[PDB]
Amino acid sequence: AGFGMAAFCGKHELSQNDKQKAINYLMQFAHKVSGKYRGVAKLEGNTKAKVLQVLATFAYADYCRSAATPGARCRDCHGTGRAVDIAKTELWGRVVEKECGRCKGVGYSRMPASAAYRAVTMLIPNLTQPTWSRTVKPLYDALVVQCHKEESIADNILNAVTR
Amino acid sequence: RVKIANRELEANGKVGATYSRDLLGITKASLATESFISAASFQETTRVLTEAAVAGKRDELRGLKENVIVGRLIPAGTGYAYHQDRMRRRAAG
Amino acid sequence: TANSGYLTRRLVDVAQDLVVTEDDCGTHEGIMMTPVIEGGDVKEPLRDRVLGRVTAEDVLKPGTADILVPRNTLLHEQWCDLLEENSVDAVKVRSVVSCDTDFGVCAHCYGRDLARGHIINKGEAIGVIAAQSIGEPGTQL
Amino acid sequence: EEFDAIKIALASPDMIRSWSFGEVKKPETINYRTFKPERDGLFCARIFGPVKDYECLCGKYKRLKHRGVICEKCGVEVTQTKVRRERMGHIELASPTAHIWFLKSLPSRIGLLLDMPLRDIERVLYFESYVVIEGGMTNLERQQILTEEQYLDALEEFGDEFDAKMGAEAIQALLKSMDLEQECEQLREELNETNSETKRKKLTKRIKLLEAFVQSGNKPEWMILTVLPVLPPDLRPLVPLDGGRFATSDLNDLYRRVINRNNRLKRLLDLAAPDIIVRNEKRMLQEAVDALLDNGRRGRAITGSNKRPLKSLADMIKGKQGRFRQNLLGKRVDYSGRSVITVGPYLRLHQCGLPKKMALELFKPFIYGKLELRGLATTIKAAKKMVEREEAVVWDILDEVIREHPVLLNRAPTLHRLGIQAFEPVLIEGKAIQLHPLVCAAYNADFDGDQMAVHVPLTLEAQLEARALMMSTNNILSPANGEPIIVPSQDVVLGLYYMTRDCVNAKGEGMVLTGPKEAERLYRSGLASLHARVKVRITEYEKDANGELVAKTSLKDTTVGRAILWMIVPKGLPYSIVNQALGKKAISKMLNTCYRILGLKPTVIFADQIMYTGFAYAARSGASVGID
Amino acid sequence: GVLKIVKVYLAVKRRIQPGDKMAGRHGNKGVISKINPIEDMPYDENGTPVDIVLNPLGVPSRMNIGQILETHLGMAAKGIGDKINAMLKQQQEVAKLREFIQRAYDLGADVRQKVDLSTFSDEEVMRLAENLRKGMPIATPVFDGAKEAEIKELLKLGDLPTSGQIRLYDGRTGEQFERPVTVGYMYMLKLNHLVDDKMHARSTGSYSLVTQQPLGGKAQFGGQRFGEMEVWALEAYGAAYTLQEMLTVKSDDVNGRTKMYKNIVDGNHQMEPGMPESFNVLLKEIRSLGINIELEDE
Amino acid sequence: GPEEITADIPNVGEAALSKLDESGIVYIGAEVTGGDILVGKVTPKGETQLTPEEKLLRAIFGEKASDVKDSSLRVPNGVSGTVIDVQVFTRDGVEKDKRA
Amino acid sequence: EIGRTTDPVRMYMREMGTVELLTREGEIDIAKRIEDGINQVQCSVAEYPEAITYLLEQYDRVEAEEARLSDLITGFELAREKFAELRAQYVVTRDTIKAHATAQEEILKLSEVFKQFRLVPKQFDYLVNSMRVMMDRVRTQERLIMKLCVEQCKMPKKNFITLFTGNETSDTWFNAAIAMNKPWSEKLHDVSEEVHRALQKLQQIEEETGLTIEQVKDINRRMSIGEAKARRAKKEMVEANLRLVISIAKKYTNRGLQFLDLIQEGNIGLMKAVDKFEYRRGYKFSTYATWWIRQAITRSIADQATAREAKVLRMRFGIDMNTDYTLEEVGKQFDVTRERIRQIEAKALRKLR
Amino acid sequence: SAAVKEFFGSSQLSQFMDQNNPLSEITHKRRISALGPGGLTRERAGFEV
């Protein structure tokens, strides 16, 4: 609820101080999930806390990355994700559209996890892309799909009291 | 500037420059101060901004008029401690 | 009123950046103060001409008492009465135009804060105070 | 947020295109059928931004779901409308044109940069005389300005050995072809041979300009404009009037003239127009750009339909009604009121009478905070309707908020620093501010219709500055001289003068009184007058060589009124300051002596008591004015 | 573009109150400071309290003595009207009323008009006395007026003190004022500078388009200007935080003033100031003039 | 659309329409005070300037393109007084109103 | 006198006072110079056989019955037999071009049979603009071969002009330049591949026009000086009539525009009146010029004040519905395309004809 | 109509009449102004006039 409104309003940059609140809430959620996963709890307090905080910022930035991110819009569809078919409009006559072939309709270009991997491997260098793929990235897309659930339940608790 | 240059030149062992002080008027001194923002907000904004754009000046924001235009604490009164703290922070680091 | 307002604005802008940024600049320069005796009478006595200033050096005379005020003393009413009872006519006090400080003045070269009665605290906009003090009685002129 | 200095320089054409967001091509501001701005115009939403917050122009992406997309129906990026006052544009001028500041702001600095007369430079820019730029022969040295006759016969003489041009392109070619460091070393060479101070000052001015150009690192050909930047269209809005018609802005009109003449010059240049027509169009574009940058500088100012000259960008920067003096050095300010002032003769030196409706408007978010702290209001709208209906608990919370929260009272013109002072407000009925009578000298206020502004300090630091610096009890002495600004004026003065002044055979003369309390008893009972010469026993005090007060008692010869004034004179002052007829100078000397002996707080209490007894005894005197 | 206009006409009845500018015909202006009770007002030996108490210190340095002479002549006029009112309340005659009104009309030294009441009827004299019972109106021409001798003869006709000064008593203590006080009738005007029209306060309202500063005026609910001179006053005090909050959070700091409003509602008296939007406007205008000015990140 | 002069006003109590007539206009002789409504006017479907307290709530939830704005002629604050004359000037061509 | 003035309309009226007014004969012989210029460029493009085969392919392209001959030929029922005569001219200029005064008499006969073609102006300047872009292609080609002659020599290039003003097609000038052995010729062996590219370009252009380089070079020189004299006569005509522009723009002054803008739009209108002026109509110039001047000034001041092809052929031409539609109705309802629908109509006309 | 309405509406001497009392109306009608079209100018005049 409050996590959903804070993360959404910090993503779309309104009341622009709840981004840090979303970082801290996702860090506490990482504290919650790190007890039931193997490769995350292999460190001490300060190091694991710092790398999970910067991983929370990276997962929130992966949630914050929209079609209005500076340097992330699709070059062809201009963010829309909808192009016209000249051939199908010629053989049909009716107005028809297709999925944008470049960005596959999502509108923008998503953020790679290897930037986060390079940003965190300057503290712990012995973890590699096998370990990053088999251990870290399930936690990473778990956080971003969880923040999607948080946004959607904020949307449901909003349209239950407004509609 | 002449006094500071003569200070450091007689410190490191040079000859130093000689000068002759000039009594500017009140308007001419306000327009010939080394803060182009203060001089432009006083008077003759066309002339002052033209000369400052040609010379490529920069205002270091050391005066009360400059820190009022910018919207900060002035270096006077209760803002003086904050301004010398900011000066030692930008000088140490 | 129009002319005095324009004069006050010119004075504030010529003196806007002057702030007491030191306690003592460490100079020996001064201004020889004297009672103005222009015309046929004394116009301003030495007591109020020097009251609140800071002496550039000692006063040196055999005189009637051989009074030796120290260097850099804030002249209160007590020291004014001392100079009156010891009959002094020329005192050298540290002025603002002979201050050794760069980008501001020292507190000793200014002297007494006329609004509070003690020495001036470092960080007081004496240029704005002086410009308003000169440009206020222009309506009375 | 974090920045140290502010730098100023000339603007390169690549930098002018770098701030831009799209080239402005058409001069239409908005369509007048529907209120929608035209594409590539002065208000174009594809260039400057959408007119609604998170909504495209044609109405295709109206939600915040698309936080930015370029709507392919109308090209508009779906973002907030705050970017309309921040995104610039640019116009690509066909012929380059001179900047009017770097031409007609004396000294011209293009004529000073090239050692050319401004008359010759304007003759070149007005397409009247050619100027050579380079020449392979020795007959035509550089900057030799030729007329049309000399240009045609030199064309029949040499033809291709030289190349002379005209207009601002010639001056841009001259500035681009000049050599900065070579002119620097040549001028530093030529400085030594001359001996006249005028020629030497000219050489030092030119070498200072050249050294300033080299040390800044700009290029001298950036004084000739090839790209012209456009102000964002929410900083030059199209305000609608009450008739349905518009009062369009002067910047929109000047940009419209510049764009129309630039587009016509593009058409005449690609149409292969005659040289006279294309020179007239280039000259007109030069005049339009110069008008837009500074209307009244070069020729006659382009006036609008109302016979008034158009406000340019320089007219928006400079002057009393310009940006600095009207909106940057002084602003308009929230949490501030204004009312007519009256007398506060019952007040103390730190108090002012503030009306209840004025204070209820000034202190409204503090009232909302106290309402939501006490739980009386559930939400902000409930607190707002509670203040809108003005409950008795709203007036009680206002009484709680007002207490120990100073306000600043200010009267214009604020000539000296005691034109703003801080006071602790007293909630009064009525609509006028009540000012203490002893601060009216420092305010230069009377009560014939003066008004004062109230200002509420919000932050804790501002409240502490008002309490510790700007409080009226904190500045008793002037900042100009050391003398007190709190002098009693004319009614206190008339009352204390009538009090202390003696008479020879008034009533109850020659008595011997036990003290000032018996003198007050005699006067209030009616057995003695204020001016009866009488003998009372005055116990006066005196500070010793240390800080302790020694007491002494004697039989003084005085009047009854001086004995009653001794009841309010504090402990530490002698009877000699009371034992004469007190005028304005004597009361001011008494207050200054009380200051120098006792300090600040007994001086403030003494000034209050002086005001009260002077008012009371001037009233009991019954002084009047008759024709006799 | 107009469908219909509805024009409503209010009608306010405005009473005097403290704050209202009142004036006489001699440049004797001023503001009502207090509306006193009639038991508190000073009164004469007949118990009639005065209506307005004016300061005599406004007379000598301003030299408008026609104020005092109008006061004396108005006292004499109201004394004559009081005698006519006493005769009309006693319902005496028409002959004594005709005699007294004629005796009051023939008092001047060499006055031009000759008002003869023998040509008057009885109902005409009764109507004249019914219009004269509230005071006898007196024409005093400019540079042709009554003198002190005429004023004192009129005051002696009306059984009034010829010096124009009576004994007044304090309404509160009951005691007598020591010196005799000038009491009379002066013509006072209510000027159009009413404190209902001058009183205006604002907390937060609407803002200008370009500068994002508050508006100006009682009509559009604007804030008071904190001008250059007031900025100099705060600079001379040293009130840097007060000056900074005048410059930013009470003014053109759009993201700072909403923070300050919510901080005040949350009971936290602390601001977070930022850059003035008018300074951003000025930077954009100097950039539009073809001059690259920019803030420098150290 | 046109702005309507009408009796119904969104989001006011019955302490506002206590002095209006059936057409939205005030009665001749009504002892109104400050803040009362003399003639109610509502904008068409779509507001004209939105407050930031609910501008974010119209952004993230959706501007309804409905729920018209209160734009009524109110008595200014601190101003009492009766109403002595009303005059309605309608444009030539349309049917006016019952009160007009 | 130049100098102490700043009013730009005053400077315009001063600088326009140099020229003089024209008599009745002045428009006649300046129009004679105009006709001389356009007939000069017409006869210099008439001798080119590429223009002849271009007008023949234009003839059997318009003979496919997709457009009427009204917007092809104005005048001289006769165009068919005259184009058969032009085809006979084509086959005689194709078979006896090999032998050499027969080429001279046949190009002289092409130029005189070219002159009676009183065709429309737009197709004519479109086709000679196709000639213009191909001679601009060979112009930048010869400019490209001059700069590749210069860019590695670093010598006085005058001797290469003396050995290059011959035929400049074979390699005899190349061997005569390298073999004589001045100090550039031994280090000028790196030009061999680009001059061989120039030789294959020369054989390519020899087979694409059947004509050498010097004759097309001086014919391009002749048409360039012809169009230069035509443009100079147009400029000398249009500079001597700006007083008419000021006299017509004298009435529209305080109607929304500044005075100089009105006379600039009038100068544009006067230039458009000069460009399409006919002198065999009795009226001198002014009654034809004033319509264009008034039209430009009033227009400026008023401005300042398959399946898809089948259904757009239905809706645009109005085939079996209630109301017909123009390009704007379908350009609103179907897609934001406006003139693209017109090119769809053109493609459908091409695919149906 | 444009000329006379421009004058009578927005000249410098076509003034919004003061009618507080009858004295204000009679004094506004009996007023003489040294300023106006072709007269003096306010900031550009001194003690001589």
Add this chain to the structure above:
DNA sequence: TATTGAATAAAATTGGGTAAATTTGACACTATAATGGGTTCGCTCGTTGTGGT
């Protein structure tokens, strides 16, 4: 019994380009004679920048 360094498909993303749709600005619409314009001074004081002997 397991987690992970190296290696590798492999599809998504960046960058470049490119031929075909598609905008975009202009132009048509036309022939008695006409041929050179309307717009501010009763402001002072001072300062700085320009031109002859």
Add this chain to the structure above:
DNA sequence: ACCACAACGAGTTACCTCTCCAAGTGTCAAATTTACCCAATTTTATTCAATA
């Protein structure tokens, strides 16, 4: 070198109150976008096995 003319700028602070500020419609070449083709790269999963 010194004098005699032109042009800019400045002139108190607020505060108020008012009024006043013609008709689309069809056609052409160019250039501009636009849907899309394809190498370089690189991010992510997936196999081997090899230490632990």
Add this chain to the structure above:
RNA sequence: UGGGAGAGGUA
């Protein structure tokens, strides 16, 4: 929306 002029007035 809320700008710019002009006029008048107050201290």
